[PDB]
Ligand binder design. Sequence first.
Ligand code: CL
Ligand code: CL
Ligand code: CL
Ligand code: CL
Ligand code: CL
Ligand code: CL
Ligand code: CL
Ligand code: CL
Ligand code: CL
Ligand code: IR
Ligand code: IR
Length: 217
Amino acid sequence: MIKLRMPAGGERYIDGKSVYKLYLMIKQHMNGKYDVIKYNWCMRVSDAAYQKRRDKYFFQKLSEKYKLKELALIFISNLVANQDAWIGDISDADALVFYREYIGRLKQIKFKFEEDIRNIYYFSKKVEVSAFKEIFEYNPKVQSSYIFKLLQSNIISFETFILLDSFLNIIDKHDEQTDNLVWNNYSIKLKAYRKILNIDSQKAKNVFIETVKSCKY
Ligand SMILES: [Cl-]
Ligand SMILES: [Cl-]
Ligand SMILES: [Cl-]
Ligand SMILES: [Cl-]
Ligand SMILES: [Cl-]
Ligand SMILES: [Cl-]
Ligand SMILES: [Cl-]
Ligand SMILES: [Cl-]
Ligand SMILES: [Cl-]
Ligand SMILES: [Ir+4]
Ligand SMILES: [Ir+4]
């Protein structure tokens, strides 16, 4: 149903500067300044900028131990879900600890998706929607939506939001109806992550329908 797109030759070990380049390309991608898929996980960087770094040891240590696929996951998981890495330096974000905790989450994505769907459904009853669709539609009054609010409160994950988006078109519709800064900040990350996620919309839809049905009856 869902797979993360990854740089080619993921079993490879690379050097410290290369680890730094990988981090920078993913960082820029998550900020909407680059597209790792468009450029096939390759990017040129400023050596002067790298040399100016006071934390070159961080990238060196990671390079000694982790394969390319693991390095990519460490950076992706942190830059997507670790708010401490959204603006703060990766060498200051407790990245490895965060990554270890996040890989376990990625391994159970389908179960987590189902869990999130059930929670979205029961929440919809608590707020007394007149129709389930009201949860996902942008609300001009509050410049937001219940589904976005749930993501903000960390009740559901980014993967769940993007999975729902695959067949509900939530992100693009929100983007066209508002300029809200808070949404935009999240939307930049959502669209960036969506680019590296390979999602089978039909399968995600099937899971959604089956899960809601089990909540209703
Ligand atoms: Cl599958
Ligand atoms: Cl599947
Ligand atoms: Cl599957
Ligand atoms: Cl499957
Ligand atoms: Cl399947
Ligand atoms: Cl399957
Ligand atoms: Cl109606
Ligand atoms: Cl309607
Ligand atoms: Cl309506
Ligand atoms: Ir499957
Ligand atoms: Ir209507």
